[PDB]
Point group: C3
Chain length 335, copies 3
C-alpha cells in the first residue's frame, strides 16, 4: 500500500544529462515525486533559419528523463500555464490503465493535475502527450521523453553477471513535418494554431522535412558534444515516439544492447547497428577503448547527413596501436 511508504522529491535536469540516481540500491520501495510544466514555443531548428511551432515538456526536446527503481511509485504533478493556448495531458508507456494516465491528466491552460502509478516493470519507456483528436500533432511537435525504471539490483548480462554505467546520456530523435510555400521555401507561422492544417498535409505524406536529435540540426556538436574518456562505460538512451530509427556509433559498437528497451530480457552483444521501433525507447552500453571524436547517428545515412539525425562524442585518453594502426600513410602508388 503506497499511502504507507516514504516519499522522496527529485529535481529534474535538462537533456542530454540525466538526474543523479543509484543503480543497485538497498533501499525499499518509495513514492517518488516529480513536477513538469508544458511550454508552447516557436524554435529555430536548422542553419537556414527554419522555425518549428513546438510543444514541449519543461521547455526542451526531448522532455527530461525520469529515473526510479522497479516497485517504486511515480507521482507526477503536470502544470499547464495560462500563457499556453492548448489543452495537454500525459501517457506513460511505463504505466497500467486509463490510457497510460492520459484520461486522468487532461489540463486546460491555467490548470494542473497529480497522478500516481506503480512502476512495476523494468526498462526504458516513452512518455508523450495524447489529447483526444490531436495526438500525432502534439507528439511530432516535440512532446515526448523517457521514464527509466532500473531493476533494484542493477543491470545484468544474459548469464546474470553485473553490468554498470559511469555516465548516462539521453537522446530524443524527432521526425519533423515543416510545410513549404509556392516559392519552395519553408513557412513561418505567427501562432501555433495557424501551423496546424498545413502541417497535417505534410504528415500524411509520411516524409519528414527534417530529422533531429534534441531539438535542432547539430544540437549535439561543438561546445555541446557528448563527452567521455577511455575506460569509461556510457549508457546511451534513445527515444523515438513516432518513427523507426537505427542507431550506430562510428568507430565503436553496442557492447550490450536492449533495443526493445526492457531490462528483464537478456541483452545482445557486439552490435554494429541496433533498431528502435517508433513508439519506444531502447538502451545501449559501450566502454571506450580509443580516444577521438566519434559520431553517433541514424544509419539511414540520408536521414543522418542530409536531414539532421547525427551528433558527436569527444573522448579523451591514450591511443591503442593493438586495436588499430596505420601501417602505411596515404602516398603515391608505387611504379
Amino acid at each position: 500500500d503506497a499511502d504507507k511508504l516514504p516519499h522522496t522529491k527529485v529535481t529534474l535536469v535538462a537533456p542530454p544529462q540525466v538526474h543523479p540516481h543509484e543503480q543497485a540500491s538497498k533501499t525499499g520501495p518509495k513514492v517518488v515525486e516529480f513536477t513538469m510544466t508544458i511550454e508552447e514555443k516557436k524554435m529555430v531548428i536548422d542553419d537556414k533559419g527554419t522555425t518549428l511551432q513546438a510543444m514541449t515538456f519543461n521547455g526542451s526536446m526531448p522532455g527530461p528523463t525520469l529515473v526510479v527503481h522497479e516497485g517504486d511509485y511515480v507521482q507526477l504533478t503536470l502544470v499547464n500555464p495560462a500563457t499556453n493556448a492548448m489543452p495537454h495531458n500525459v501517457d506513460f508507456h511505463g504505466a497500467t490503465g486509463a490510457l497510460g494516465g492520459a484520461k486522468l491528466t487532461n489540463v486546460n491552460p491555467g490548470e494542473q493535475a497529480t497522478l500516481r502509478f506503480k512502476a512495476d516493470r523494468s526498462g526504458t519507456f516513452v512518455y508523450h502527450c495524447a489529447p483526444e483528436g490531436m495526438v500525432p500533432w502534439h507528439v511530432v511537435s516535440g512532446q515526448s521523453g523517457t521514464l527509466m525504471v532500473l531493476p533494484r539490483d542493477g543491470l545484468k548480462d544474459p548469464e546474470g553477471k553485473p553490468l554498470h554505467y559511469d555516465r548516462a546520456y539521453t537522446i530524443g530523435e524527432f521526425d519533423l513535418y515543416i510545410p513549404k510555400g509556392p516559392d519552395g521555401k519553408y513557412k513561418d507561422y505567427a501562432t501555433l494554431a495557424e501551423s496546424y492544417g498545413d502541417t497535417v498535409q505534410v504528415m500524411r505524406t509520411l516524409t519528414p522535412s527534417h530529422i533531429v536529435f534534441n531539438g535542432k540540426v547539430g544540437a549535439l556538436t561543438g561546445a555541446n558534444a557528448l563527452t567521455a574518456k577511455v575506460g569509461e562505460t556510457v549508457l546511451l538512451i534513445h527515444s523515438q515516439a513516432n518513427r523507426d530509427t537505427r542507431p550506430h556509433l562510428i568507430g565503436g559498437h553496442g557492447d550490450w544492447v536492449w533495443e526493445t528497451g526492457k531490462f528483464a530480457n537478456p541483452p545482445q552483444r557486439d552490435l554494429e547497428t541496433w533498431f528502435i521501433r517508433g513508439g519506444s525507447a531502447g538502451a545501449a552500453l559501450y566502454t571506450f577503448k580509443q580516444p577521438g571524436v566519434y559520431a553517433y547517428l541514424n544509419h539511414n545515412l540520408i536521414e543522418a547527413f542530409e536531414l539532421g539525425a547525427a551528433g558527436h562524442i569527444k573522448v579523451e585518453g591514450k591511443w591503442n596501436d593493438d586495436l588499430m594502426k596505420q601501417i602505411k600513410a596515404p602516398a603515391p602508388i608505387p611504379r
Copy 2:
C-alpha cells in the same frame, strides 16, 4: 505416412474471431481438412465513401485464421468460382516446397484444387495469393491471412513454464494504394481490371493512401470493438503481408511476445511496442489488470490516427488503485 492418419474437418470462422481449438493436446498427428473460396468484391474503406477494388479469401480482410498442431498435415481445398474474373492460388509461409504451394494451386475461374503439406514448424505464419506476374497487386488488394501451428504441449516461457490464453483475436493490417483524379478526389472503378494501371503507379511511390485493420477505417470500434475482462489473458495475432508495422496497447503491455512469430524461440517480456516485419505474423499475450477502453494501434501515430491503423478493446471489471490513482484532479494552479 499421412495416408494412414485420421482425418478431421474444421469449419472456419470470420475475423476477428478464431475457430475453436485445443492448446496443449494428448492427440497424435491428424490430417486436418479446410476449404476456402476466393471472392473479388468492391468495398467501402472509410468515412468519405472511398472504395477499394478488393480480392479476398472467404469474403473477408484478412482471410480466416487456420489452427493446427505441430506434426499435423494441412489439407486445403481452394475454390475459384466462375463469378470471378482472375486466376488465383495460395503460398503458405508455413509450408516447404513449390513456392509454398503456389505452383500446385493455380486455379482459373470455374476451378478448384486440393493441396496437403506437413505443418512441421510451430508459430504464426502468413498465407497469401501469388499468381505469376501479379503478386503485389493481389496481396495489397486484400488476399492474406494467418496459419497458426501450436506446439503439441502448448506455449512456453523462456524457462519452459506453461503459458495460456483464454481467448484469441486475429488482426490483419492492410496498406492500401488508392489512386486520385485531377480534382484530387479518390477514384471509383467499375471493374477490378480497370483499377490496375493507376494502382501500380501509386504502389511504386511506396506511400499508402490508407492503412486499415480488418478491411476498413474503424473496423474494430463501436459495436465491433474487441472485448475482454479483468483477469483474462488474450492472444493478439497480428499479420502484415507487405509492409512493416509496430503494435502497441495503450494503457497496457505485451507480457510475453514473439514478434517474429515462431514459438520454439523464447518470447520477450514487458514490451511497450513490438515489430512485425512485412511478410510475417507475430503474436502477443496480455493479462488485463484494469477495466476500461484500451486502444490497440500501429505506433507510427500518423499511420494510426490519420491513415486508419487503430482499434479498441473494451474491458469489464473492477478498478485497481494500487496500479494507478488520480491524486489531484485537474483544477486551477494554486496562487
Copy 3:
C-alpha cells in the same frame, strides 16, 4: 602483439561467391592481408537501359566479402587509381577507433594506404566508403560490402551445439536514387560529378527509384541464379548499408538466423521473414529438403517485384511427397 604473428595473403573473389576459408580451425591468430581497388564506372541497372553513375570496391556491387577468424588482424591495402576523379576511404564496422579506419585511409586519385585492425568480435559487419561531406552519396552509389569474422570453433546453436554450411553466398541490396527529366524519363549523365546535385534532390525524398540485388534488376536470375542441392546447407549473407530490408525464401525458411549478424548471440529458428537494419549485415542458414526454383526476395513485395529486390536459387534433387503433395490438380468445380 601483431608484429610477431605469421602473415597470410588472401585472394578475393567476386560476389555472389565468397573466397575459400575454414570454419572451425586449429590455427592460432594470423595477420591476414587483402588488397582492394576503387573503380568509378557508369553501369546499366535495368531492362529499359537506365544507367547509374556508380562507385565500387573492386568493380562490383557489392564489394567482395572478406573472411577471417576472431582474434586475427585484418590488414588492407586500399588503392585509388589515377583514372578516378574523386577521393575515397574505408570505414569497417568490424573495427575499433578512428571512424572505423576512415580517418587513416583518405586516398586521392593516384594514391594508396595500408590499415591494420584487430578483428576481435565475431559476426558479419558492413564496410563502406565515408569521405567527409560526401558520405551518403558514395554509399548509395555502390561502395559497400561485408567482413565476416567467424568464431575460432565455428558457428553454434542456442544450446552450444555445432552448426555448419556447405556453401556461402553474399547478397548486397542497393537502394538507388536515379533522377528524371521533365519528359518523365530517367537521366543519363556524362560524368560522375554531373549526377551529384540532381541525385541529392531524389535522395532527400527518401523514395528509391530502384532497389536491386548485386548491381542490377535480375542480377541473380537465369544463368546467374544461385545454386544448391537437396541435403546441402547454405549460408546467405545479406548486407544493406543505408536502408532497412526484410529477406524471405519462397518455399523455404531461415532454419537458424542472426538477423543483427553477431555470432556470439544465440540465433532464432523457423523464421518466415527476417530483418536487416540499414547499416548492417545479417546471416541465415537453410538446409534444402525439396528440389525446384526458389525465390529469395525483400518481402515488401512492391520493392521486390516492381523495384528489383529479388533473385532465384535453382535446387537439384528428389521431390518429397511427405512434406508436400498435390492431392487434386486444378479441375472444374464439381456440379
